Amino acid sequence: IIEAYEQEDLLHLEVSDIPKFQTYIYQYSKLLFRWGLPLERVKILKVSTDFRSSYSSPYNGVLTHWIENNEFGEEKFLARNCNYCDLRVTRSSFICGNCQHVLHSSCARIWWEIGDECPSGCGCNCPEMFD
Amino acid sequence: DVQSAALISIFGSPRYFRDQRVDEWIQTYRDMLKSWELFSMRARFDVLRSKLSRTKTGVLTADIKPRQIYIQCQNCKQNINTPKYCCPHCGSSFPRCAICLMPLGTSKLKLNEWFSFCLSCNHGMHAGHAEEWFDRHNVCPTPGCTCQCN
Amino acid sequence: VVIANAHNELIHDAVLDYYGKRLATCSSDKTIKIFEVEGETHKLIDTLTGHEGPVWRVDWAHPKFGTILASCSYDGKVLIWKEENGRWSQIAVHAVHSASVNSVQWAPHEYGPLLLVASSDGKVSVVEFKENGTTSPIIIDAHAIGVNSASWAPATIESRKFVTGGADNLVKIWKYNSDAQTYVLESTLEGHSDWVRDVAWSPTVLLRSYLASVSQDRTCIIWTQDNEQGPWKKTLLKEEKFPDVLWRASWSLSGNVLALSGGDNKVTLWKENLEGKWEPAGEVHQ
Amino acid sequence: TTPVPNGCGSCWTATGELFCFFANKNLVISKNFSSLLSDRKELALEYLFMDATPEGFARNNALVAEKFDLDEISHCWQILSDMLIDQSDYDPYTTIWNNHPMGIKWFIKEAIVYFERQQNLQMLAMLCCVILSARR
Amino acid sequence: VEAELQEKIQTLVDLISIATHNASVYLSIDDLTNFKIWILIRDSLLWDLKWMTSSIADPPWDTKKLIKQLYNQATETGNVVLTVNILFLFQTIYQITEIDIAKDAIAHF
Ligand SMILES: [Zn+2]
Ligand SMILES: [Zn+2]
Ligand SMILES: [Zn+2]
Ligand SMILES: [Zn+2]
Ligand SMILES: [Zn+2]
Ligand SMILES: [Zn+2]
Ligand SMILES: [Zn+2]
């Protein structure tokens, strides 16, 4: 009873219980990618990788680096702010290459339906110069 | 009425004469537009200021925000684009989208053209792919990240 | 989806792409034709002409690497075609063998953009197509008198192996060795009295690793393996013999269904029972 | 030592359509053979294994396999749905019965064996992802 | 020979009713660990009923195999009531154990 109270999981599965989850899930993910379902393979691989991390690099390399600008006052706080809403950006950003300005994903998907230049007004045509 | 003063004084002040009152009116109207959550009108006002601050030569005399962030690659620790699907300084492979397995391209804005890079887990997806994934999910799609990017 | 007189003289391969949306038909007319096969419509796209000889096989690359189609022909030149902005164009040339290149097949996408080039002089070559800095194709003498087919083993998890069918009554399994930086021989399989025409590995591995080797003595052997490193169980597909020479073997993408291609212009389908008796499961003729 | 050139062949696709070409002009035809393939695209478009309860995944899969005329798969999902029933209140005997080797785990092991012999990779990986998503 | 089929169908139907009643009376006192067992037994009986109406190793959802496995889990855990209930209801139609073991279990109960 105490051990059941000390268990947040519905089941205490092990690798001995499911010996071949990795190969079967990976092969079905390949079969799902051969169909027009590219999100289901990501879901099933996320489940498999979550269990693999539970009992124990194609998406690496690029790290986003803030420009270490020697500032004194509010522009230190205003460096890490979105250029559409002036809120702090921390997840799911949009970065241009010609001008080094952030946007939120929602702010970018709202602004580029109606705008053509950078919302900070630097004169950069970000739909044609973000590479 | 600071609205009319701002919209009139942006036509000629930073192009011709630096005065503190116009800057006060511009900042007050931008803070008012942010107060009413009219962010689109603030952005249009800023791009109109940048259009109307251009001289006869073409030099922009308005005050713009300094450069904020840039993308590294951690193999040569340089910028991947100069202000291809490979780094232009060390040739290392760019990370792929987690959905369609397509890499980053470096060389009217469609959604399926830019990566929506998270600044916490540093994992990138196309914006259409990120919208399609994060609409029905709340975790990073990469195998081994726990970061709610949306 | 019925296509009539796609090529003027003869046909050698017709390989669907990864999504089942584009079909690459090659022939002896030195021509490769791309068809959009969405729905029942089979609208032609392009009429690629690069080869100086009859074209044997083509193989689409993964969409991970883009719209890339490899090709092999009688002249020993491996031509590689990429469609950029709707404009199909040749990119790279792989002419390393002194005879006709017989089999071309891309590696599984976990291994990178690697091409299995097998030629009729008994030599095979695995070549990588990355950027402008192309790699040296590693060449090993697979067979003594000739190699007519070469197919890859699937990457069920996130070493690399490929089957190699020769012209000297043999089927050879090759394994990558990191110390030698090449492919070393793993096992040697002898079950044929004639030239092994097509060797095909099963893309799905549930409790067994299947093979399908066909040869000119009108027979089919299904070589299975229970463990990761174990002996191969040789078993027949028919108690009798096939009417004509067997050319091709193409496994189903999920579920071990085998599509043979005899010399009588007749595709025979085979599906295993629960016991292990290879009952026929269909037939396509003309 | 170039072999005799071939004139016919085949190329499978992910939906079970067998694209066969033939010689005597040249003819390319496609024949549907999805009934010989256990894994079906129609179930993957309707299976759910994350955005519900652990009982909800198996009940939804049972309904999907029932509406597509798959009796054994529907009964397997129904039995797994019965074995994954929980409630708002927490009693320890449900956890003790779940962690027992002769319940749930035995069913999953025997179902993996049975669907290995039936060559059903879709049902194998679906059983694995449901039993791992039910773990929480 | 149709009378035997009709008797078997009626036996399956009122055994489904008995299983539903047992599941309900377990759910009355809120012990889900045996309500799940009787729901499994009810659905196995419904599967057998639908295959009687419609008319290598056995699957784990086969009626005899699943009922025997639930019996074995009950007699290993120590649930006397559940194993004895299964021995009354599903012994003649599904030969679970020997007659000696079943009769000894009923006598001990
Ligand atoms: Zn924003
Ligand atoms: Zn900008
Ligand atoms: Zn820009
Ligand atoms: Zn670099
Ligand atoms: Zn993408
Ligand atoms: Zn992440
Ligand atoms: Zn993130």
Side-chain angles (χ1 to χ4, degrees):
Chain A
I1 305 292
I2 305 299
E3 279 174 352
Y5 282 156
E6 289 314 295
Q7 170 165 338
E8 214 65 42
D9 300 353
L10 194 154
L11 289 145
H12 180 64
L13 284 186
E14 286 185 9
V15 180
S16 47
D17 302 332
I18 316 299
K20 305 184 88 175
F21 73 104
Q22 197 167 354
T23 77
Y24 293 158
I25 283 177
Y26 199 65
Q27 287 170 70
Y28 191 51
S29 72
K30 278 160 53 191
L31 196 65
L32 273 167
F33 190 74
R34 289 203 82 130
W35 304 325
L37 292 99
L39 298 165
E40 298 281 327
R41 77 158 279 268
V42 183
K43 292 174 236 190
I44 206 163
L45 284 198
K46 189 100 209 174
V47 162
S48 162
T49 309
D50 273 332
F51 182 57
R52 218 151 72 233
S53 67
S54 165
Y55 80 85
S56 71
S57 65
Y59 321 104
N60 219 18
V62 169
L63 60 93
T64 69
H65 188 216
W66 298 102
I67 297 286
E68 194 176 356
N69 269 338
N70 302 351
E71 307 308 309
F72 307 101
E74 284 185 354
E75 52 265 13
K76 251 184 159 177
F77 283 89
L78 292 166
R80 308 182 176 185
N81 277 325
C82 175
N83 289 278
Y84 190 79
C85 64
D86 284 330
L87 300 173
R88 188 180 176 183
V89 64
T90 179
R91 285 141 178 190
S92 194
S93 83
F94 158 68
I95 308 160
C96 180
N98 203 4
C99 75
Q100 292 166 13
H101 293 145
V102 292
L103 284 181
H104 286 112
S105 197
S106 297
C107 294
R109 84 171 282 189
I110 287 168
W111 175 235
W112 302 127
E113 284 186 351
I114 49 185
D116 281 327
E117 298 184 353
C118 188
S120 52
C122 57
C124 172
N125 313 294
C126 293
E128 292 186 354
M129 279 281 123
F130 70 101
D131 303 317
Chain B
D1 190 13
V2 73
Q3 173 174 57
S4 276
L7 274 297
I8 288 164
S9 309
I10 55 154
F11 274 99
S13 162
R15 202 172 159 171
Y16 298 128
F17 48 94
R18 289 291 300 162
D19 45 352
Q20 184 177 182
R21 308 178 268 200
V22 177
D23 299 331
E24 188 170 9
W25 298 334
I26 286 166
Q27 287 318 296
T28 314
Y29 191 46
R30 283 169 76 253
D31 293 8
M32 275 160 100
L33 285 165
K34 288 197 294 181
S35 187
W36 305 317
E37 285 175 26
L38 300 176
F39 300 118
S40 176
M41 302 294 162
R42 184 208 63 86
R44 291 186 199 180
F45 182 53
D46 275 326
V47 305
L48 185 63
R49 286 173 42 212
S50 295
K51 264 150 67 174
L52 296 170
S53 315
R54 300 290 178 89
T55 70
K56 180 76 181 172
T57 311
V59 192
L60 174 60
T61 60
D63 178 77
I64 64 169
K65 193 181 271 281
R67 293 181 184 271
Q68 303 178 286
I69 205 167
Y70 87 111
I71 279 174
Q72 292 189 343
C73 76
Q74 214 184 5
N75 277 128
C76 71
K77 292 175 182 179
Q78 296 279 313
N79 203 3
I80 75 162
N81 61 6
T82 303
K84 181 67 176 66
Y85 311 108
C86 278
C87 175
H89 297 335
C90 67
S92 184
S93 293
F94 280 163
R96 283 182 151 89
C97 178
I99 310 299
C100 63
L101 300 181
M102 292 286 288
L104 187 42
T106 52
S107 59
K108 297 185 59 181
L109 192 46
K110 304 183 182 180
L111 277 76
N112 279 316
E113 285 180 359
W114 46 271
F115 285 173
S116 163
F117 267 104
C118 177
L119 312 175
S120 298
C121 57
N122 299 344
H123 300 136
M125 318 157 71
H126 294 110
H129 301 165
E131 180 199 3
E132 203 177 2
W133 166 258
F134 279 118
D135 185 78
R136 44 186 311 175
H137 291 84
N138 281 320
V139 76
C140 183
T142 57
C145 191
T146 318
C147 172
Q148 319 191 359
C149 314
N150 194 2
Chain C
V1 190
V2 180
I3 296 94
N5 52 88
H7 292 267
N8 183 31
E9 172 206 9
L10 212 55
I11 186 158
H12 287 155
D13 218 347
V15 179
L16 264 191
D17 71 316
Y18 208 72
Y19 280 86
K21 216 67 70 176
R22 289 179 186 180
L23 176 70
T25 72
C26 74
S27 63
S28 64
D29 302 333
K30 316 165 185 186
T31 47
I32 306 163
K33 288 172 162 285
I34 314 297
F35 301 93
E36 288 286 335
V37 294
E38 46 178 0
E40 212 188 4
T41 317
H42 57 93
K43 163 180 172 48
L44 193 144
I45 294 302
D46 269 322
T47 316
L48 269 51
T49 61
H51 285 293
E52 296 292 326
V55 191
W56 306 114
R57 280 203 190 184
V58 293
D59 197 75
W60 295 88
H62 208 278
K64 181 181 184 291
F65 318 106
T67 315
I68 292 175
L69 179 80
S71 167
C72 77
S73 55
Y74 185 83
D75 57 355
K77 305 182 179 58
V78 171
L79 296 181
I80 294 91
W81 314 82
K82 184 169 180 66
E83 183 184 354
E84 275 278 341
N85 314 318
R87 284 189 178 178
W88 272 103
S89 56
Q90 179 195 124
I91 291 300
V93 188
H94 177 75
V96 74
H97 302 303
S98 59
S100 168
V101 173
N102 269 333
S103 160
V104 63
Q105 184 163 346
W106 281 103
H109 68 269
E110 299 91 354
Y111 301 155
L114 264 67
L115 200 62
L116 187 40
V117 166
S119 170
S120 73
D121 53 357
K123 325 201 175 209
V124 296
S125 63
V126 176
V127 60
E128 178 155 30
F129 297 96
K130 48 167 209 191
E131 301 99 14
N132 51 347
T134 183
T135 80
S136 80
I138 44 173
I139 308 166
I140 56 171
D141 300 330
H143 283 98
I145 200 63
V147 177
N148 307 298
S149 49
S151 180
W152 280 102
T156 58
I157 51 173
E158 309 174 356
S159 179
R160 322 181 159 165
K161 286 177 177 181
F162 64 94
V163 63
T164 296
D168 46 351
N169 315 325
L170 277 175
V171 168
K172 292 184 182 179
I173 300 287
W174 300 89
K175 189 190 179 180
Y176 197 64
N177 193 5
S178 62
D179 291 340
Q181 293 180 356
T182 44
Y183 282 95
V184 303
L185 195 55
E186 207 265 332
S187 65
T188 295
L189 283 68
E190 49 272 14
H192 294 289
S193 309
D194 273 324
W195 292 19
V196 186
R197 292 308 303 269
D198 201 9
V199 286
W201 203 291
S202 180
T204 52
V205 181
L206 323 182
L207 284 186
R208 269 168 209 98
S209 279
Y210 284 87
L211 273 168
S213 81
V214 295
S215 53
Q216 303 194 155
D217 50 353
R218 312 150 59 195
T219 198
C220 173
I221 319 294
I222 304 299
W223 317 79
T224 70
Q225 188 182 185
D226 294 329
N227 300 337
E228 305 181 359
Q229 305 94 11
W232 293 87
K233 183 185 191 295
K234 157 192 171 184
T235 188
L236 275 295
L237 199 82
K238 275 187 55 184
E239 306 176 1
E240 304 177 359
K241 307 177 61 58
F242 280 80
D244 216 5
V245 61
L246 274 161
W247 287 324
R248 292 281 176 86
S250 66
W251 281 110
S252 173
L253 265 58
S254 184
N256 286 302
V257 182
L258 167 67
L260 286 200
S261 306
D264 49 348
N265 282 322
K266 162 172 152 273
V267 168
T268 67
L269 279 179
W270 307 92
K271 197 187 173 184
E272 208 175 30
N273 263 327
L274 273 300
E275 303 204 330
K277 194 169 175 64
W278 280 102
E279 211 165 6
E283 174 187 356
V284 189
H285 60 86
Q286 291 202 336
Chain D
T1 68
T2 72
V4 178
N6 64 313
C8 76
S10 62
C11 185
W12 277 98
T13 198
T15 52
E17 302 263 348
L18 191 54
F19 275 61
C20 294
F21 61 94
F22 294 107
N24 291 317
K25 76 156 192 303
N26 318 121
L27 179 82
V28 177
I29 46 168
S30 81
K31 206 172 161 172
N32 207 339
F33 280 111
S34 174
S35 52
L36 321 172
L37 272 75
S38 305
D39 304 348
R40 293 180 46 173
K41 192 185 176 182
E42 291 89 6
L43 307 154
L45 292 152
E46 297 197 358
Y47 279 166
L48 280 183
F49 48 88
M50 194 173 305
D51 304 353
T53 61
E55 192 259 333
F57 315 140
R59 195 153 295 272
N60 179 221
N61 297 350
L63 292 175
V64 164
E66 191 183 0
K67 80 167 65 67
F68 278 106
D69 203 4
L70 287 164
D71 284 357
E72 296 286 335
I73 295 97
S74 71
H75 196 230
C76 175
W77 286 125
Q78 182 66 252
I79 288 302
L80 197 51
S81 165
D82 306 326
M83 272 180 310
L84 293 163
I85 290 180
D86 270 337
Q87 62 183 357
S88 183
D89 193 31
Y90 187 71
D91 55 354
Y93 299 116
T94 43
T95 312
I96 298 159
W97 182 83
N98 285 347
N99 297 336
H100 209 265
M102 320 183 77
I104 301 185
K105 303 185 181 181
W106 161 85
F107 186 83
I108 297 304
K109 282 185 183 178
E110 294 280 337
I112 290 170
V113 170
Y114 174 69
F115 285 121
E116 271 166 352
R117 289 176 315 194
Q118 285 290 111
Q119 305 275 340
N120 205 321
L121 177 56
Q122 170 165 20
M123 190 60 175
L124 272 166
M126 276 298 306
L127 276 170
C128 294
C129 67
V130 175
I131 198 67
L132 286 185
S133 65
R135 194 192 34 111
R136 287 167 161 177
Chain E
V1 295
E2 204 262 331
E4 318 287 328
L5 182 63
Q6 185 44 61
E7 192 256 330
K8 220 78 173 193
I9 288 170
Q10 190 46 247
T11 313
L12 282 181
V13 162
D14 58 0
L15 273 166
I16 282 157
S17 81
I18 290 164
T20 318
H21 169 78
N22 284 327
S24 312
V25 70
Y26 282 160
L27 201 48
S28 80
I29 65 167
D30 289 331
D31 51 353
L32 202 76
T33 183
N34 310 292
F35 166 72
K36 289 203 277 178
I37 295 290
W38 272 112
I39 280 300
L40 287 154
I41 294 175
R42 170 177 78 94
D43 285 327
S44 298
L45 291 177
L46 273 153
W47 177 252
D48 211 9
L49 179 72
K50 89 178 285 296
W51 279 93
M52 287 204 95
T53 308
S54 78
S55 80
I56 190 167
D58 268 346
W61 52 87
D62 189 22
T63 78
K64 185 188 277 192
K65 196 171 178 182
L66 188 58
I67 285 172
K68 279 168 90 139
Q69 190 69 215
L70 295 191
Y71 164 92
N72 287 336
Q73 193 194 34
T75 191
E76 280 273 331
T77 312
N79 211 352
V80 189
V81 189
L82 195 147
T83 183
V84 159
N85 213 0
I86 295 188
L87 274 177
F88 290 106
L89 297 164
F90 321 104
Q91 163 73 38
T92 306
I93 48 172
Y94 309 125
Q95 317 174 1
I96 296 190
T97 57
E98 313 175 2
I99 306 298
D100 300 359
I101 303 179
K103 283 202 280 191
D104 278 316
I106 299 313
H108 280 107
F109 182 68

